[PDB]
Design an enzyme around this catalytic site. Structure first.
Site, short mmCIF file in Angstrom:
data_model
loop_
_atom_site.label_atom_id
_atom_site.label_comp_id
_atom_site.label_asym_id
_atom_site.label_seq_id
_atom_site.Cartn_x
_atom_site.Cartn_y
_atom_site.Cartn_z
N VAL B 1 17.56 2.35 79.64
CA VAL B 1 18.14 1.42 78.38
C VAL B 1 18.89 0.32 78.70
O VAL B 1 19.73 0.34 79.60
CB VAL B 1 18.72 2.59 77.37
CG1 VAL B 1 18.86 1.69 76.00
CG2 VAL B 1 18.02 3.71 77.42
N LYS B 14 13.71 -0.30 76.46
CA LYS B 14 14.11 0.99 77.12
C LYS B 14 12.60 0.93 78.41
O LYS B 14 11.71 0.41 77.87
CB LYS B 14 13.62 1.99 76.08
CG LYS B 14 14.84 2.89 75.54
CD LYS B 14 14.36 3.85 74.48
CE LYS B 14 15.67 4.13 73.64
NZ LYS B 14 16.21 3.20 72.69
N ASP B 89 13.36 14.23 66.09
CA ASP B 89 14.64 14.21 66.56
C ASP B 89 15.56 13.25 65.91
O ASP B 89 15.80 12.16 66.31
CB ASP B 89 14.48 13.92 68.05
CG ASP B 89 15.84 13.97 68.80
OD1 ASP B 89 16.88 14.74 68.27
OD2 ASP B 89 16.00 13.36 69.91
N1 LIG Z 1 26.11 0.79 68.78
C1 LIG Z 1 24.73 0.70 69.09
N2 LIG Z 1 24.29 1.61 69.94
C2 LIG Z 1 23.06 1.57 70.30
C3 LIG Z 1 22.01 0.87 69.49
N3 LIG Z 1 20.75 1.09 70.25
C4 LIG Z 1 20.94 1.92 71.16
N4 LIG Z 1 22.40 2.26 71.24
C5 LIG Z 1 22.87 3.35 72.18
O1 LIG Z 1 22.10 3.88 72.89
C6 LIG Z 1 22.07 5.44 72.89
C7 LIG Z 1 20.85 6.28 72.52
O2 LIG Z 1 20.94 7.31 72.52
P1 LIG Z 1 20.03 8.43 71.52
O3 LIG Z 1 20.52 7.92 70.05
O4 LIG Z 1 20.22 9.79 71.74
O5 LIG Z 1 18.70 7.93 72.04
P2 LIG Z 1 17.97 8.17 73.18
O6 LIG Z 1 19.32 8.36 74.28
O7 LIG Z 1 17.16 7.00 73.95
O8 LIG Z 1 17.19 9.51 73.17
P3 LIG Z 1 16.43 9.73 71.82
O9 LIG Z 1 17.03 11.01 71.11
O10 LIG Z 1 15.08 10.27 72.56
O11 LIG Z 1 16.13 8.46 71.03
C8 LIG Z 1 23.02 5.54 71.67
O12 LIG Z 1 23.84 6.28 72.26
C9 LIG Z 1 23.84 4.35 71.31
O13 LIG Z 1 25.08 4.17 71.84
C10 LIG Z 1 22.31 -0.01 68.43
O14 LIG Z 1 21.85 -0.84 68.03
N5 LIG Z 1 23.88 -0.07 68.55
#
Ligand SMILES: Nc1nc2c(ncn2[C@@H]2O[C@H](COP(=O)(O)OP(=O)(O)OP(=O)(O)O)[C@@H](O)[C@H]2O)c(=O)[nH]1
Lengths: 250, 303
Positions: B1, B14, B89
């Site tokens: 990411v 991603k 999820d």
């Molecule tokens: N503030 C902010 N954070 C983001 C944004 N997009 C992604 N993130 C960060 O990316 C992280 C993604 O964590 P999750 O929401 O658990 O998603 P994931 O880690 O890819 O795992 P999944 O549950 O499969 O989606 C978050 O903790 C956010 O901090 C955004 O648009 N704004």
């Protein structure tokens, strides 16, 4: 056609107060009978009174600065100020619908003034151009020059036909002949004189800064200098001002 | 990411058939204005805030705004299931709150499995455990269906109203499933008894009891979520969920024009201010700035 924008031209807007030409109506005997103060009023004196014409720039119905008086000048047979007032506002600070109120005043008694008229002429006329030349505004009687938008005391409304044509003549748009226009211009002068004479209202003459430090040929024009992502976000990357406010405070 | 940049926007990327499914979400959720699936290595729009961060920022979501966000979470739940889409999820880290309080439900998990062997937590740790706060909202029956999600939405609402405190960790959730545990402390932390009942009903241990998100909205119409949400804010706020007013100038002008009707119904004014200011900090033409100042003056006495 040459012009300078209002934004660039940084000087003080100036206006000339010419001559209030007209006839002033009086009251009856009962008015002075009930209120003896009218006898000592300015209007009831045999000679022309020492009126002074205030001026204030308005915009959107909101006053834009303090009014400006006319330096004291004695009068014997006519109202001929011929004074070059200087206004507090400048060209780049005039909004589009700016309008100059001009109120005449006269004595009514010890420590009191009474409006003897009121006129309101827009500054930026049609096509967004600063009015120039020598304009004769109308005079609404016994009402202070109103600045509200739309104005309730407007200044300027076959005379109209000749008003347009004369302009087109001196802007180059007309047939060229010398003697014919030399006589026709005196004809229009007489026609305008007759029209003014017939009208019952007064008429306050006024002139703008047609001649300035720069060439007179120029004119003033209103101007100013202002699928990856689908959902809009208009503040994506800026300062968190509330965060800063909290951080500074304690 | 990792974040990236775009010619006229920002992006989040991603790195790890399925492609066809992602586009299906693009069409279905184009009608769903409170959703945002994978727009395209997966790419999508970068939203201002996430639920957790938004909770932990100087502007602090009130009870009114938190209730509105719960309403919009349920609205996204409906919009998703109606079209034939199930999140799978849900959690605080996947509900992005734009700068104008427009909740978007993102990261539609179509790659995660359905059943988790209860004797081996490897699957949870590899797939679902990303924030590593140990919070687990997976549906107890799984150890998809609207039931499997409404549970997650209720848990998210309870967490949101508890200022980041989780309803279950993994151990707490597993104990709850076994029938020998009940988080009475977290349920007691909820600000309002109405949403406390909402969470309690949404999180019935046996799936068959859980209702639809539409019904949960219907019951709350009176006191939990004021009627203003259903009638006025839902349509009116949807105008800015599209590209009709990309410019802050148009947004301010439209809001100024409609102020007569807005004050008539709206209180929800907190959302209105969260809309106006995002336009404020970017205006370009002077007329727009003066209109925004007039709007701020108009709203001030009501606030
Ligand atoms: N503030 C902010 N954070 C983001 C944004 N997009 C992604 N993130 C960060 O990316 C992280 C993604 O964590 P999750 O929401 O658990 O998603 P994931 O880690 O890819 O795992 P999944 O549950 O499969 O989606 C978050 O903790 C956010 O901090 C955004 O648009 N704004």
């Amino acid at each position: 056609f040459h012009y300078i924008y209002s934004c660039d031209l940084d000087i003080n807007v100036q206006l000339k107060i010419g001559s209030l030409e007209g006839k002033r109506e009086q009251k009856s005997y009962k008015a002075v009978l009930e209120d003896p103060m009218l006898k000592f009023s300015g209007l009831y004196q045999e000679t022309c009174s020492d009126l002074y014409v205030t001026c204030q720039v308005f915009a959107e119905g909101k006053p834009l600065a303090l009014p400006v008086r006319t330096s004291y000048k004695a009068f014997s047979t006519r109202w001929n100020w011929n004074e070059w007032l200087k206004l507090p506002v400048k060209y780049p600070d005039l909004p589009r619908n700016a309008q100059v109120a001009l109120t005449i005043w006269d004595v009514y008694g010890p420590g009191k003034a009474v409006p003897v008229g009121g006129t309101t002429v827009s500054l930026f006329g049609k096509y967004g151009m600063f009015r120039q030349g020598m304009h004769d505004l109308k005079v609404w009687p016994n009402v202070e020059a109103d600045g509200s938008e739309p104005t309730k005391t407007p200044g300027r409304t076959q005379m109209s036909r000749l008003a347009k044509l004369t302009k087109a003549h001196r802007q180059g748009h007309m047939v060229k002949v010398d003697w014919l226009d030399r006589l026709t211009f005196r004809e229009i002068e007489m026609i305008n004189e007759s029209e003014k004479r017939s009208s019952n209202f007064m008429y306050l003459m006024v002139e703008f800064r047609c001649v300035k430090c720069d060439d007179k040929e120029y004119g003033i024009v209103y101007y100013e200098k202002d699928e990856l992502v689908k959902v809009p976000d208009p503040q994506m990357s800026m300062e968190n001002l509330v965060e800063s406010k909290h951080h500074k405070l304690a | 990411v990792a974040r990236a940049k775009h010619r006229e926007g920002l992006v989040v990327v991603k790195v790890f058939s399925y492609k066809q499914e992602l586009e299906e979400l693009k069409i279905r959720l184009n009608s769903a204005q409170n959703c945002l699936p994978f727009q395209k290595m997966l790419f999508r729009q970068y939203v201002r805030d996430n639920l957790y961060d938004r909770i932990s920022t100087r502007p602090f979501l009130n009870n009114i705004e938190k209730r509105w966000i719960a309403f919009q979470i349920l609205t996204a739940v409906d919009q998703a299931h109606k079209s034939g889409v199930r999140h799978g999820d849900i959690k605080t880290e996947n509900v992005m709150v734009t700068s104008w309080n427009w909740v978007l439900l993102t990261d539609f998990a179509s790659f995660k499995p359905t059943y988790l062997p209860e004797d081996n937590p490897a699957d949870f740790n590899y797939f679902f455990d990303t924030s590593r706060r140990r919070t687990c909202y997976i549906a107890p029956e799984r150890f998809l269906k609207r039931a499997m999600d409404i549970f997650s939405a209720g848990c998210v609402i309870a967490e949101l109203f508890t200022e980041g405190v989780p309803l279950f960790d993994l151990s707490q959730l597993l104990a709850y499933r076994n029938g020998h545990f009940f988080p009475e402390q977290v349920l007691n932390k909820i600000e309002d008894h109405s949403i406390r009942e909402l969470v309690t009903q949404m999180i019935h241990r046996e799936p068959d009891k859980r209702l639809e998100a539409e019904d949960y909205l219907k019951q709350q119409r009176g006191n939990a979520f004021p009627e203003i949400f259903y009638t006025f804010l839902q349509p009116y706020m949807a105008q800015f969920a599209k590209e009709t007013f990309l410019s802050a100038d148009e947004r301010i002008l439209v809001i100024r024009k409609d102020l007569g009707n807005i004050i008539h119904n709206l209180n929800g004014l907190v959302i209105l201010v969260s809309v106006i200011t995002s336009c404020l900090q970017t205006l370009k033409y002077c007329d727009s700035k003066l209109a925004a100042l007039e709007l701020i003056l108009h709203l001030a006495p009501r606030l």
